[PDB]
């Protein structure tokens, strides 16, 4: 889910646009693409998104 900062600053240019509105992504498949989940965490640390 997106915070207000994420609601604004998540532009197509940004690397975080890949997972801006992601859902129903199983945990078992996360290890296949570590960069995706690391980018999600780094976006969370910026205060843009929240991983639920």
């Amino acid at each position: 889910e997106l915070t207000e900062r994420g609601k604004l600053q998540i532009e197509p240019e940004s690397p975080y646009f890949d997972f801006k509105y992601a859902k129903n992504r199983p945990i078992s498949a996360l290890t296949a693409t570590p960069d995706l989940y690391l980018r999600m965490i780094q976006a969370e640390n910026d205060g843009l998104v929240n991983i639920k």
Binding site: F17, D18, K20, Y21, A22, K23, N24, R25
Partner: protein
């Protein structure tokens, strides 16, 4: 150890241009510096010095009939869409048509699967972003005239109530800065508002 690695076409292109074959391919849109303008072809230079080329069928719009020289000039920079890349000779072909330069926005293969992407929230957010791009600025109008008063319709009627029949007041109109409503007292507690359309206006506040 393995044998000495010898660069291929993609590695040579990346070495000499610092643009990968992923970030520079078919369909992308880039700004190019025009260098030559001719009757049938146009020669441009990109940011990384890759020599481009555009043909007569890709310079002008189908409904256009003017000569290419009249339309563009040397030294001008324009947007163009890539139609082919020659990774060995460092040459590319481009098109300046509207159908290629502007419509192709979604250049990334984002997996918008309905079960894996929140389509409705994205649509609502995009609709709200368009509804915020529709925002505009507006301000009141000031007119200098002895019988002009910055009053509402009811305010003008109340102002004309204290005055006898035949006196005239002028107020701004609700239809826009190009319209003026003139209110005059027809009878006691009876007033007529007449809208006047302005033409050849020097300014919004001007008459």
């Amino acid at each position: 150890r393995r044998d000495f690695h010898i660069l291929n076409e993609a590695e040579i292109f990346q070495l000499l241009t610092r643009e990968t074959v992923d970030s520079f391919r078919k369909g992308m849109v880039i700004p190019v510096y025009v260098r030559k303008v001719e009757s049938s072809y146009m020669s441009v230079s990109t940011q990384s010095l890759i020599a481009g080329n555009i043909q007569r069928q890709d310079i002008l719009e189908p409904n256009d009939r003017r000569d290419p020289r009249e339309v563009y000039s040397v030294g001008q920079t324009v947007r163009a869409c890539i139609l082919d890349v020659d990774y060995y000779n460092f040459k590319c072909q481009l098109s300046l048509l509207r159908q290629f330069t502007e419509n192709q926005v979604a250049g990334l293969n984002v997996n918008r699967n309905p079960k894996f992407w929140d389509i409705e929230s994205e649509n609502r957010d995009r609709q709200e972003e368009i509804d915020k791009q529709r925002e505009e600025s507006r301000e009141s109008r000031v007119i200098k005239h002895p019988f002009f008063h910055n009053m509402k319709s009811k305010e003008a009627e109340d102002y004309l109530a204290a005055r006898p029949v035949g006196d005239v007041v002028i107020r701004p109109s609700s239809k826009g800065s190009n319209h003026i409503t003139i209110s005059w007292k027809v009878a006691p507690q009876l007033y007529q508002h007449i809208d006047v359309l302005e033409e050849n206006k020097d300014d919004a506040n001007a008459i």
